[PDB]
C-alpha cells in the first residue's frame, strides 16, 4: 500500500540535485552539504578524512531520517581555507587511497595464487 520502491534509495529523481551547498550563517567559513541518495557509507569516510585535515575545525555527518536516503555533512575550516576545497581534497585523498589499496590487493591475490 505504501512500500516505497527499493531503487528509490539510489536513483536520483528528475530535477533533483545530487548535492546542494548551503552556507551556514552562525559561524564563518562553514557550509552544509546535503547529498541525496546516499547513506553512512560515504558520510563516515569523508568525515574521517576531513578530521585529519588540520585546517578543518568541524567535520561531521548526519542522517535526518533513516527512511530517507539523503545525508547532511557540515564542514568548518579556517579563514585561509575553504570548506568546499576540503570536501574535494577529502574525496581526492580517498580515491588515491582506494586506488593504492586496489593495486596492492591484486598483487597480494597474485602472490597468493602463485605461492
Amino acid at each position: 500500500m505504501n512500500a516505497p520502491p527499493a531503487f528509490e534509495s539510489f536513483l536520483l529523481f528528475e530535477g533533483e540535485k545530487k548535492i546542494t551547498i548551503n552556507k551556514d550563517t552562525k559561524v564563518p567559513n562553514a557550509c552544509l552539504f546535503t547529498i541525496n541518495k546516499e547513506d553512512h557509507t560515504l558520510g563516515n569516510i569523508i568525515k574521517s578524512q576531513l578530521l585529519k585535515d588540520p585546517q578543518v575545525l568541524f567535520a561531521g555527518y548526519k542522517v535526518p531520517h533513516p527512511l530517507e536516503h539523503k545525508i547532511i555533512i557540515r564542514v568548518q575550516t579556517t579563514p585561509d581555507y575553504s570548506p568546499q576545497e576540503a570536501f574535494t581534497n577529502a574525496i581526492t585523498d580517498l580515491i588515491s587511497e582506494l586506488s593504492l589499496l586496489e593495486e596492492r590487493f591484486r598483487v597480494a591475490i597474485k602472490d597468493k595464487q602463485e605461492g
Binding site: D24, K26, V27, A30, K47, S48, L51, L57, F58, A59, G60, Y61, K62, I72, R74, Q76
Partner: protein, 151 residues
Amino acid sequence: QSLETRAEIQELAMVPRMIVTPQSNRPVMGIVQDTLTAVRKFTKRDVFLERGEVMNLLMFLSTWDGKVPQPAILKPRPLWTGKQIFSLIIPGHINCIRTHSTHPDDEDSGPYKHISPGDTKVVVENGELIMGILCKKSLGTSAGSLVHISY
C-alpha cells in the same frame, strides 16, 4: 478543515503548550526509556568524548551556535565530557538543583556536600551542567525538574 480551527489548535492544544499540566503543576511528558538510561550513563564523571564523536553529536543539535566548547581536558589528549555537551543542550541560563536516585542522605550533612564523590547533587548554573548525574528526578515528569524549569 478551517483556518480558524487551524489557528485555534496552533495556540491552545499544541504539544509545547501542553507540556505542563494544571492537574499537578508538573510536566506530564519527559525523557523516556532509552534517552533516560543513556543520559544517565552519559553525564557520569567517567564519560569522555573524542574530537570525532563530539562532532557527530553536535551535528544533531538544532540549538547550536556552531562554536565547539573548550574541552575539560586539553592534554595529553583533547577530551570533552558528557556534561560539557549537555550544557549546550540545556537552553538559556536556567538554574536548578536536584539529587540523583542514589544520593545518600549522609552526604549533605558531612563534608563533600558541594563536591559529591558519586557525582550526585545535580547543579545547573547559567545553563551549564556543573555536576551531577541526571535521571528521572532531574528530567522525568517530577516537579522542579530541568524541563519544568525550562517551560
